[PDB]
Every structure is written in C-alpha cells, then in structure tokens.
Design a protein around this ligand. Sequence first.
Ligand code: ZN
Lengths: 202, 127, 180, 214
Amino acid sequence: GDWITPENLTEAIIKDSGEDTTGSLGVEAPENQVALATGDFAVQNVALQMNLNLMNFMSGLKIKRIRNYMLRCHACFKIFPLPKDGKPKHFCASCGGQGTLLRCAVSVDSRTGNVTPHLKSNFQWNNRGNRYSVASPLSKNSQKRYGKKGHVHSKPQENVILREDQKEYEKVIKQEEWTRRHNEKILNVRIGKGRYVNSSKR
Amino acid sequence: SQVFGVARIYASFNDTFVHVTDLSGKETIARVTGGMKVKADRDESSPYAAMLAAQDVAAKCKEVGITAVHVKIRATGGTRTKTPGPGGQAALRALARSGLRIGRIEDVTPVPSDSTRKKGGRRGRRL
Amino acid sequence: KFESRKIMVPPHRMTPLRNSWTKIYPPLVEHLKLQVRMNLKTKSVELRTNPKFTTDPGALQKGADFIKAFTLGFDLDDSIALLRLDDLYIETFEVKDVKTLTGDHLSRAIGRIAGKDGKTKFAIENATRTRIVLADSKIHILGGFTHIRMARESVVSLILGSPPGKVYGNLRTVASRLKE
Amino acid sequence: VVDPFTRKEWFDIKAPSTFENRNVGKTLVNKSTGLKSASDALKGRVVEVCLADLQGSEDHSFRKIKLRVDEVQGKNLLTNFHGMDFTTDKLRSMVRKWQTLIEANVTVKTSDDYVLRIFAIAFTRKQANQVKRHSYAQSSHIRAIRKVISEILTKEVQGSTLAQLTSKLIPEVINKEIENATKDIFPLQNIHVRKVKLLKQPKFDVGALMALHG
RNA sequence: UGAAAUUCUUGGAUUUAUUGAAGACUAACUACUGCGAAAGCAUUUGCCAAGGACGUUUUCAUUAAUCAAGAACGAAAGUUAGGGGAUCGAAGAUGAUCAGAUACCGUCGUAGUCUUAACCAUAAACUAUGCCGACUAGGGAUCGGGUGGUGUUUUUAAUGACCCACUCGGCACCUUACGAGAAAUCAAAGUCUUUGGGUUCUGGGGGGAGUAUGGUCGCAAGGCUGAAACUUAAAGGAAUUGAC
Ligand SMILES: [Zn+2]
C-alpha cells in the first residue's frame, strides 16, 4: 500500500472523495485567453464538450482527451453520470430496470464533443438469482398470515421493495440520510434479495 | 546494541506470571508473580497486581543490561480455556510503557489435536 | 527509532472495514500521531511509530487494541472507547469450555442467551455496563474488570440451562448493590 | 546472598553461511570453573529465531528457524540447522469455511543420512468465473493430489546435503513445483511446506560444521 | 473459591529448557452436506468382500405386496474370565460450615471408562407420524449419474476444473389450498356422510397397576405375557383475555 502520515493526511482525505490529486490521471492527449484547472471529472466532462479549455495544473498543458468511468444500463443502453458516493443506484431512471446499471469505461473528446464507451469483448453474463418464489398479497395463505389485529405498526407485515416509486422506498432513502447525520455528529439497509436468495438459510 | 531478551507471560485465572530469560530460554533473568505483590488471595488475579509485577521485572532487566524483549503470551490451554485473560493484557501494556523495546509478539497457548476428558462430569461446571 | 505492529482482519470483517475506512484513520493519525496504512496484499493493517513527533510509549498499544476490538466485531463507536478511556479489557470464551453439547442442544443454548428479539442480551448489557457479541459458539465481553466478571457469571448460568426468568431476578440484585 | 549475575559470562551466537546475516545475538552462562566446564552447558541449547531476521526481508516473517549449538571457539557459539515451523497466527489465517484442507507428510533420508519428517498443506480455490459458493473437491481427487505431493518430496530430499535442502526452502522453490504438477487435477492455493522436524542425525564430525562456517 | 481450609515447598514447589515412556482421542476444515435396515459412522496407506443411483435396441418371463410362527442385528449402564490401566470417576475416606447471584464447593480414589471370548435385549430406541401403489404443484439451490453447447481456462489435442440448457434419483427449502382439521398447523395429516386401491399392529373414562398369580427366557440384575375385588365425576387437548 502507501503510508498515510500526518503530513499527507489532507491529500489522502481528498483522494477518498474520488478527486484526482495527482493531475493528468487518465489524460490521453482566442488562443489560451482563458483556461480552467480542476481535478473533478464531473466538471471536466462539461468543460470538454462545450469546447472549454482545461489546464493540466500539474504540468501546464491543455487537455484534449480524457478517460474515466460512468454508469451504463445494459438493458436500454443509456449512459448516466457516476454519483459521488461512487456506486450504482438501484434503479435505472429511464427503463426502470432493477440492478441493471454497470460502471463503464468512457472517453471524451473536445474535437468531436461525443462520448464513447469501451466494452469488454468477451463478457460472460451471470444470471444467478434472477428468478425466485415470492408471496402474493391476495393468496389465502397471505390473508391468514396477515392476522386479526389489523395493521401491525411494529414488524409491519413487511412488503418487498420492487418499484422505484413504491412508497416504502421513499421512507428508506430519507431515513438513511437522517441516520447518517445523527451518527456522525454523535461520534464527533439493502433491497432486493441478492444472488443467493434460492439457497436455504438455517 | 539492543541485546534482546524474551519475556514469557503466563496468565490464568487465580494468578499471573511474568518471566524473562536468555534467548535460549535456559537461563532465567527475573520472575515475580502477582501473588508476590498483593495481600489477599482474591486479588492475585487482578489487573492491578499484574501491572506492579511487570514494573518490577522491567527494573531488574535494566540493571543486568537487557534493553529489548520479544514477548510470548500464553493461557492455560489443554482442556481448559485458550485465550489470555485481562490480567495478561495488563502486563503487556505495562511493559510497553516501561521503555524497553518490544520485538515480535506471539501467542503460544497449547491446543490439542484431540483431547483427553475434561474435568466436571456430564452436567458441566462453572468455569 | 522505529517500531510497528501488524494485525490481520478476517474475511467476514473485511467489507465493514472498507465501508468505515475513512472514519477510523483520522482519529489515529491526528490524536495519537501514529502513521498507518492498509496493506491489501495480505489483508492486514499496519501501525508504525515515528519517534520525532510522538508523545509517550502508550500510544502504540492503544492503537492496536482499538483495531483489535473492531475485528472481533464490536461496533465502531464501542471500539473508539479504547482510545479515550484507559482501563477497558476484553474477555472471551466458548460454550464448550462450560459444558459439552453438540447438536440442537448447541443451537438452543445460544438462542437462550440472545432471547426473543435480542431482549435478553440487551438486559445483561444494562445491568452490567458492558458490551457483548456472540460470534457463533464464541462470546466476547468488553468492559471494566469487575463488571466483566458480573456479566460472565450470568451468561454462564444460561448455558448451563437455567430458565431466563430466574436470571432476570438476579440482575435486579446486582444492580441494587452497585447503587449501595 | 550470591547475586549470581556477577558470576555470568556472555557469548555470541553465529548462524551458518546458508543465511544472509549471521550475528544472531547473545547468551550468558555462569563463569567456568575447573570443577565443571561451561562448554558442556553450551552444547545443545536450541535457539529459535524469526527467518525475517536472518534474511532481512519482512515477507519471510511468518516462518521460524531452530538452531542447535554444536561447537565453541573464541567466545563464539557455532550452530547448525535444526528445524522450521510456522507462526500460529498465520496458520489460523489460512483455515476458512467453504473449502477443503489437504495434508500430506513423508519421512525420508538425506544423502548425508539425516532422517527427517516433512509436512505439506494446500487448499482448494475457485476458478475466475465460478458462481457457486464453496469449491469442494471429491475424495477421488484428494487421493490423487496427496499421491503426487508425496512423490515430489521424496525426490527433493536425496539432495546432496542437508545444507542444499536449506537453500531450497528459503526461496520456497518447492512450492512452485507442486503447483505445476497438480495444475491438471484441481486448482489449489496457499501451497506451503508447513514444518520440518529432525528425527535422527549421523555421528558428529567437525569437518562438515566448519565448512558451513569459515 | 463467592470467601477459605485440607494439600505441595529452601532436600527448591509453581514457572523455564532438552529428551523419553504409556494409554486414550481424532480439534479447526464441519454445512439447513454424505453413507447405512436401525443402533450408528470423521488422521494416512494396503488387502478382502458387499451396496444404491445412473447408462443399456442384453437376458428370464409373473418369478410379486404385506405378514402369526420362527430368525439375524440392537446406544449407555450391568454380569463372568484373561489383558491393559494415561485421563475422568457411582462407592468410600477426608477439608469448610462462613456468606443468599456467584448456596454447592476442595483433595485423594475402588468398580468402571479401552480390548479379547461369552451373556443381557432395555431408551424421549422421536419425524412423538406402519409398509406397497396411483393422482392433485410450481420455482431454483445443493449431492450422485447421463446428454447437448459455434462456451471459458489448463495446452498447440483428449482429459480435468468452471459456465448455460435438459433429465433420472436423494437430504431439504420457498410459494400455492380445489382441500383437511378442535385448533396449533398439514405435499399429506389431501383425493371421507358425494363414506370401498392391497395388507399388518394397537385403543375403548380416571385410579387400583405394569401390581398379584401362572408360564417362559436369564448366572444374576431382570425381560416377555398379564388380571379382579374395590374406588371415583371427572382426568385430558388446543387456543383467548388478563387480577393482587
Ligand atoms: Zn435502463
């Protein structure tokens, strides 16, 4: 690995944000009247295709082409910017596919202004856990399990999350934010069933 | 020169031993045990007593001229329990602050491939 | 001039560590002034002391103990007490040390410690000011020396088979004696 | 009151030339007398040292060496190889759920007719594209693997010396040979020679010992 | 140990180091995995004989299902004789008798625990669910075998390991209720007042009582079979609510 030290600490903290502290990371490449030095790929992405000038502040040269990562849904083939927590969202915002977003290598050119994905030509698809038995809400079995006490507010006859706009989903995303802030100042969840749903748990 | 010794710590219920030897283990430089530094049986296992014993050993090492020490930590093992108790943890903390250098550290508790019968009968016994 | 300790993380704990990594090194590097790195070649973390900017010999042990508690499975905010306080210890044992029991007898025994919804474990951690984790057959108890013993002697009686109701009564007695 | 440490004398331990650096450390004995000689108390007296010290590289740190004192001269203790072992923490790191543990051992005689016993360990592993969890082997495979390993060990001994064997263990070249031979049977990982224990040894001579020193 | 005493020790206990002997056991890996009629079975290698499933355009041609009498096997403890005798340890001999969480604790130790040759025939020997056959139901996980793939890797083929689809057999799981049930619950505990696929065993309110007596098996301890007089209004199952 690499040693963290009390001198290096601030740089390491920035690296864990995902920002390029080194400069020239993945760089592949009216006169010079303005230039921008920045280490954030999200800003760089906008700058390049608007035909702005980017400055490699580690070296003093303008950048024409760069390679980085973005998300791509393999169902509908649409491309999305990588969120700043650095992992996929659960649902595709276009087609509503569940878990279909994969991180994909991408290149950008000032010259063309276009965006190009790079695909692994020998990809093997994994299909473990795509299909499984799930309860139906209107079965006679379900109506017996529901019980005689009406809606139980503790252990709330749990219903699985399967849609983006299901009201159950709205709670978990905001509650996740709340628990984050509470725990961090005091110190100062998963959806679907995963691949192995079909293997019995003792 | 550092001139390494080796420290053997044996912690159990009821008492703790600190012990230090030449690198070959044949010659013993100092010992002292928890029961030497306290007035009553119920206190022999306490962490407090273990700290005193470790401070005493550290002094005598410097007098002979030992300046660094490897450490081998041990529990009773065998058919008994395997992990060093808090009285052993306390002794290790005290040595680290004594100003001796600590070399490599290793756990040497004896574990059987498979054992003879444990004392206590079929109904179990309060450990 | 240099001294270090290397300690290893077992695989089921690996992912929790990654998710927390940005939380644990700032307290070590700032408050203890140690230096640290995660060595993914061997699934270990390494703590190293620089003699030029460190305060006292106790720093290096505190750091290792803090990380050691985390790999045993204590919560991050429970482990952090080992940086702040000075007299906390860990004790551990496994149920086969108390009584030899094997099949469904073994499963029922650890169920008897947790209790329904964990409520029995939660009770023990309140009547004695301590934290408890159950990692299959092994129990770890974190706390002060005299509190640890009070916890041990009551978890033991559950695995010897006493009914939970009888144990709740004992916890009431111990709690009042601490009040005195 | 004797205060025995006034009576003690220090000596230096010298490792044989097979290892990188040879100043191991010091030991002490009570100062000799005409009544009985100190040298009889020095002979034997095994010493255990981390291999990462002898070679000066930290990647050796999980292996330990035993050295036996055989000769005394000039307040130097001159020593010879006596055994090898793993640290107990490392061994517990390897043993994990959802895989098979394979062991083999054999007893064999060197060309200079030391008699020793040697232990090997290996674990099964997943293929890069596996999807199932637990990577177990069938018992027909385990016998075949165990047979191949025993064949290799019994030909790497009958190397010309006990010393030559030591020169093989340090760079751990034996691990790579087993890797190639089993490649066709099953994918394996963490192949190691775990332990060497010396059972019997020839009648002593000084000639060989001095060749390993100066 | 909750606290302590009996006990061991300046001839050196406990602790450290180098060697040796004996008897028992087979950790981690170890799981909602495997094998066997059941009891039950886990270190390596060799020999001996047996077994299920699968594959089959091989062979015989009803040779089958269940089962009184009768027969083989049957945990632990226990009995008779020889061997062995590390550990633990009914009985026995001893230390303390204080203290309500730790209220049952410490030391030594006979038979036994292991084995050879004969006995015994019990267990919550439990899935508390007799065996054979047909139908009502679907999914993907796993163990063994087989078929297909322009599939991946080992390598330039074959084989091995892995991936995808299909199929026979097995230990389980999730979903489903035409149904069943007093309910808990149930892939059988379904196809039963719309009552009949074949066949073996057992019960008839609670005690007296698994007692007495006869027989039979056993060295013994005991096993198998097994009453009546008399007495009594309940004993029992599942599931609701919640006093001081
Ligand atoms: Zn999409």
